[PDB]
Design a protein around this ligand. Structure first.
Ligand code: NA
Ligand SMILES: [Zn+2]
Length: 324
């Protein structure tokens, strides 16, 4: 058994290289990860656990994303690797981050415990209701956050549930609803809705829909199709289904060229097998904006766009009824 803690700069391929794992084995792991793409997002501090057999060959890899979540890659008799995801539901605690404006909101928010990303999420959500340049105080704020713990250990997982500002120029408050978007007290959403399709009408034919229980034709084992396939010719324009920011731009051996956009604290969308990517990391995009050209890169039986919608990092049927 090998315990490896991810450090700045590491990639799954780099870790395998330093731990002596063969290229062929790296490819089997990348192959099964096509349908999950968990290993591409490894961050410093997370841990990889490698289980070697009597022959000193990798028999199982455990990717500890957090103390309550792990992806398990197991070697099968046929040489391939199978995937299993395990999640433990610890306990969630509520924490209130309150402060007064004497520094600017950002400074005061950071001083009271909120992170940069939390401050960004807050300013993003409240941008139309608050001018963080003119509405300046004496004014205070209260942020309700839910933090997940495991026993006495903070998992690092958290989510802002409510945002309220006590302003002299008028109080403002927003709450995270069941649909993953923030609404004001009157029920007006502070975040824009999404388009259902990532392509033009001409290519909306679905050749293969979302199906987490899909069984492999050869082995009979469950190999989930975590996205929707659209019948696009190589070169067809691909558009973002929502406002957001490009957070991932990679060239994967199996998923081919792919992109991931973060729309808000809850939603993300993935676009795989692209022939060409027209945006870069950090770039903000609008709903309906062209972000790439469909392709046939990676591993596939034919050209097509594989589209995914993730809710709190869990894939869901992009064509499902309830979803903003
Ligand atoms: Na290698
Ligand atoms: Zn697909």
């Amino acid at each position: 058994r090998i315990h490896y803690m991810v450090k700045v700069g590491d990639t799954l391929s780099g870790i395998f290289a330093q731990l002596g794992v063969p290229y062929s084995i790296l490819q089997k792991i990348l192959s099964v990860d096509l349908d999950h793409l968990q290993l591409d997002m490894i961050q410093p501090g997370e841990e990889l656990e490698l289980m070697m057999d009597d022959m000193g060959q990798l028999s199982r890899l455990i990717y500890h994303m957090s103390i309550v979540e792990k992806a398990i890659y197991t070697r099968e008799n046929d040489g391939s690797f199978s995937y299993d995801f395990q999640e433990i539901s610890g306990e969630w605690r509520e924490i209130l981050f309150s402060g007064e404006i004497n520094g600017s909101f950002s400074v005061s928010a950071r001083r009271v415990g909120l992170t940069s990303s939390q401050v960004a999420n807050i300013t993003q959500v409240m941008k139309d209701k608050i001018d963080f340049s003119r509405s300046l105080r004496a004014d205070r704020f209260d942020i309700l956050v839910k933090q997940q713990y495991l026993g006495e250990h903070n998992t690092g997982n958290s989510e802002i549930k409510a945002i309220s500002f006590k302003l002299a120029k008028g109080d403002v408050s927003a709450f995270l609803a069941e649909d993953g978007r923030f609404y004001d007290r009157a029920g007006n959403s502070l975040e824009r809705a999404f388009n259902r399709y990532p392509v033009d009408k001409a290519y909306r034919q679905i050749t293969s829909g979302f199906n987490p229980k899909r069984k492999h034709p050869v082995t009979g084992r469950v190999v989930p199709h975590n996205g929707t396939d659209f019948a696009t010719p190589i070169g067809a324009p691909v558009y973002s289904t929502g406002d957001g920011k490009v957070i991932v731009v990679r060239k994967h051996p199996y998923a081919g060229n792919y992109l991931v956009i973060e729309h808000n604290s809850v939603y993300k969308t993935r676009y795989l097998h692209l022939d060409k990517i027209l945006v870069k990391k950090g770039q903000l995009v609008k709903r309906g904006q062209k972000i790439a050209l469909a392709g046939a890169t990676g591993r596939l039986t034919g050209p097509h766009l594989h589209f995914e919608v993730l809710v709190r990092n869990r894939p869901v049927d992009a064509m499902k009824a309830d979803l903003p």
